[PDB]
């Protein structure tokens, strides 16, 4: 069971059929009761949901821009049609986030047995609440932002205490936490401060890294710099 569906998930990835990849990895996670997903299985799970949500996020942004333009043109008929369409995408967005958040809360987070996987799944919980906050409004948006900050904070506490500053999971958390402040909470100073501290702490011991471990860290650190270069100039 476990190994069959892992293999099916790898085939779906090759085929770029990511909705099927999520189904296969949801079946892997159900087959693993109490035990942790392996790193390989954990990364397949994340790629699957990342690509499935990533495509609706892209569609939502495009449709939202179109909605504003047709409103600027007084095409209320078009605006209504677009709103119905954007609503359909938000439903899919909401349902995709619900699937991984339920799985994280009922299986993956409870089963995590090391700081490595604790930070990973808590970060991921914050990520998908954050994707909710990108489009939700009113109380649903407030709820999403409150759960993101709490997930990321818990992750950061475990990460500062048990993961090297150069660990790509700790760096990824800093990266996504900083983006949360910039984009969701509209706190650019805090976004910059968080990203900068995480970067400095990583360059401090960037000597211990080898070759396989160097490419992994340096990749995240360059994304941290790229944001800072843009955020610092506004």
């Amino acid at each position: 069971g476990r190994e069959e569906f892992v293999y099916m998930a790898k085939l779906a990835e090759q085929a770029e059929r990511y909705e099927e990849m999520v189904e296969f990895m949801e079946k892997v996670s159900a087959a693993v009761d109490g035990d942790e997903l392996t790193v390989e299985e954990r990364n397949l799970l994340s790629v699957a949901y990342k690509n499935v949500i990533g495509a609706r996020r892209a569609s939502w942004r495009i449709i939202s821009s179109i909605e504003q333009k047709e409103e600027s043109r007084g095409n209320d008929d078009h605006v209504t049609a677009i709103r119905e369409y954007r609503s359909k995408i938000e439903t899919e967005l909401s349902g995709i986030c619900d699937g991984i958040l339920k799985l994280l809360d009922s299986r993956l987070i409870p089963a995590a047995a090391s700081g490595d996987s604790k930070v990973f799944y808590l970060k991921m919980k914050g990520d998908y609440h954050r994707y909710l906050a990108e489009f939700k409004t009113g109380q649903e948006r407030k709820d999403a932002a409150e759960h993101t900050l709490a997930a990321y904070k818990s992750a950061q506490d475990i990460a500062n205490a048990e993961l090297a500053p150069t660990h790509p999971i700790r760096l990824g958390l800093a990266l996504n936490f900083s983006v949360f402040y910039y984009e969701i909470l509209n706190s650019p100073d805090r976004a910059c401060n968080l990203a900068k501290q995480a970067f400095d702490e990583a360059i401090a011991e960037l000597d211990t890294l080898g070759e396989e471990s160097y490419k992994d860290s340096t990749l995240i650190m360059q994304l941290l710099r790229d944001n800072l270069t843009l955020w610092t100039s506004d």
């Binding site: 942004r61 990520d127 760096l171 990824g172 958390l173 990266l175 996504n176 983006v179 910039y182 984009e183 990749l219 995240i220 994304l223 790229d226 944001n227 843009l230 955020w231």
Partner: peptide
């Protein structure tokens, strides 16, 4: 989008 998140 200006910002980039973790891969």
């Amino acid at each position: 989008r200006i910002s980039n998140s973790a891969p």
